[PDB]
Structure formats: structure tokens, C-alpha cells
Scaffold this motif. Sequence first.
Motif, short mmCIF file in Angstrom:
data_model
loop_
_atom_site.label_atom_id
_atom_site.label_comp_id
_atom_site.label_asym_id
_atom_site.label_seq_id
_atom_site.Cartn_x
_atom_site.Cartn_y
_atom_site.Cartn_z
N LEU A 184 121.92 33.18 11.20
CA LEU A 184 120.51 32.74 11.16
C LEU A 184 119.74 33.04 12.42
O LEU A 184 118.61 33.45 12.34
N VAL A 185 120.37 32.88 13.56
CA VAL A 185 119.67 33.10 14.83
C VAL A 185 119.12 34.53 14.97
O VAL A 185 118.12 34.74 15.66
N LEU A 186 119.73 35.49 14.29
CA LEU A 186 119.30 36.87 14.41
C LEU A 186 118.62 37.42 13.15
O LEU A 186 117.79 38.33 13.23
N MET A 187 118.95 36.85 12.02
CA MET A 187 118.57 37.43 10.74
C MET A 187 117.30 36.77 10.16
O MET A 187 117.15 35.56 10.23
N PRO A 188 116.38 37.61 9.57
CA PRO A 188 115.11 37.17 8.93
C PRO A 188 115.20 35.89 8.07
O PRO A 188 114.20 35.18 7.92
N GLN A 189 116.37 35.60 7.52
CA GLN A 189 116.60 34.38 6.72
C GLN A 189 116.21 33.11 7.50
O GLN A 189 115.87 32.09 6.90
N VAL A 190 116.26 33.19 8.83
CA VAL A 190 115.89 32.07 9.69
C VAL A 190 114.43 31.64 9.45
O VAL A 190 114.11 30.48 9.58
N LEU A 191 113.56 32.59 9.08
CA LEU A 191 112.15 32.28 8.83
C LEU A 191 111.96 31.24 7.74
O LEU A 191 111.01 30.44 7.80
N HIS A 192 112.85 31.21 6.77
CA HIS A 192 112.79 30.20 5.72
C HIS A 192 113.09 28.82 6.31
O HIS A 192 112.49 27.84 5.93
N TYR A 193 114.00 28.79 7.27
CA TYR A 193 114.35 27.55 7.95
C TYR A 193 113.28 27.19 8.97
O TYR A 193 113.05 26.04 9.26
N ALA A 194 112.63 28.22 9.50
CA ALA A 194 111.52 28.06 10.43
C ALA A 194 110.40 27.28 9.77
O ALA A 194 109.69 26.52 10.43
N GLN A 195 110.25 27.47 8.46
CA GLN A 195 109.30 26.70 7.67
C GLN A 195 109.65 25.23 7.79
O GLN A 195 108.81 24.41 8.12
N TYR A 196 110.92 24.92 7.56
CA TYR A 196 111.45 23.56 7.68
C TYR A 196 111.24 23.00 9.08
O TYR A 196 110.88 21.82 9.23
N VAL A 197 111.43 23.84 10.08
CA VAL A 197 111.19 23.47 11.47
C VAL A 197 109.70 23.15 11.68
O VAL A 197 109.35 22.19 12.36
N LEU A 198 108.84 23.93 11.03
CA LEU A 198 107.42 23.78 11.15
C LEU A 198 106.96 22.50 10.48
O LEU A 198 106.02 21.84 10.94
N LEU A 199 107.64 22.14 9.41
CA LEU A 199 107.32 20.93 8.69
C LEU A 199 107.68 19.72 9.55
O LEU A 199 106.89 18.78 9.69
N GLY A 200 108.88 19.78 10.13
CA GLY A 200 109.37 18.72 10.99
C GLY A 200 108.53 18.59 12.23
O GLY A 200 108.15 17.47 12.62
N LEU A 201 108.22 19.71 12.85
CA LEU A 201 107.40 19.73 14.04
C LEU A 201 105.99 19.27 13.71
O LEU A 201 105.39 18.55 14.47
N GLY A 202 105.50 19.68 12.56
CA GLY A 202 104.17 19.30 12.13
C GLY A 202 104.04 17.81 11.90
O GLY A 202 103.06 17.19 12.32
N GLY A 203 105.04 17.24 11.25
CA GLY A 203 105.05 15.82 11.00
C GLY A 203 105.16 15.03 12.29
O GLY A 203 104.55 13.97 12.44
N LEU A 204 105.93 15.57 13.23
CA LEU A 204 106.12 14.95 14.53
C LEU A 204 104.86 15.14 15.39
O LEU A 204 104.51 14.30 16.21
N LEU A 205 104.19 16.26 15.17
CA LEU A 205 102.96 16.60 15.88
C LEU A 205 101.86 15.60 15.56
O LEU A 205 101.00 15.36 16.38
N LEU A 206 101.94 14.99 14.37
CA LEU A 206 100.96 14.00 13.92
C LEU A 206 100.90 12.82 14.88
O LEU A 206 99.84 12.23 15.07
N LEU A 207 102.03 12.49 15.50
CA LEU A 207 102.10 11.37 16.43
C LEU A 207 101.27 11.62 17.67
O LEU A 207 100.69 10.68 18.23
N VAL A 208 101.19 12.88 18.08
CA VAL A 208 100.49 13.27 19.31
C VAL A 208 99.00 12.82 19.35
O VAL A 208 98.61 12.09 20.27
N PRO A 209 98.13 13.22 18.36
CA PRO A 209 96.73 12.79 18.35
C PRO A 209 96.62 11.28 18.20
O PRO A 209 95.73 10.65 18.77
N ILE A 210 97.56 10.69 17.45
CA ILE A 210 97.57 9.26 17.23
C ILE A 210 97.75 8.50 18.54
O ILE A 210 97.13 7.46 18.75
#
Length: 73
Positions: free
Chosen positions: A32-58
Motif C-alpha cells: 500500500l505504501v507504494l502502490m496506487p491502491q493506497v489512494l482508496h485508503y487515502a479517502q478513508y484517511v481523508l474522512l477521518g482527518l476531515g471528521g477530526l478537522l471539524l473539532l478545529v473550528p469548533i
Amino acid sequence: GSKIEPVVLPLLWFEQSGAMGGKPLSTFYTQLVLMPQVLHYAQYVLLGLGGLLLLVPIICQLRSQEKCFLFWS
């Protein structure tokens, strides 16, 4: 028993071909660290980071709910 010992050998050997269409997750992380398939997991990372990012403005919303003027600069 010992009878199944040589039997699991070719069975694992088929897994090495990917004949089961899957292997243990531990093996994938290093691909995963090298292969394009990681981008699908990057979505998951973005979701997690995005949800966590919500705390910041709050936090700033709370800093405004604190209401200060004397130390407010």
C-alpha cells in the motif's frame, strides 16, 4: 497430528499465488505504501482527518464562547 503438516504446505503455496484471491492484511500494508491502491485508503484517511478537522473550528467557536475583552487582542 503430523499427517496434515505436509498438507498445509501446498495450501500455503497456493496462497502465495493469490489463488484464494486474498492474503493476510499484514502483507498488504507494505504494498500500500507504494502502490496506487493506497489512494482508496487515502479517502478513508481523508474522512477521518476531515471528521477530526471539524473539532478545529469548533475550538475557536469555544474561544469566542469564552468571551474575553481584557486579554482579547
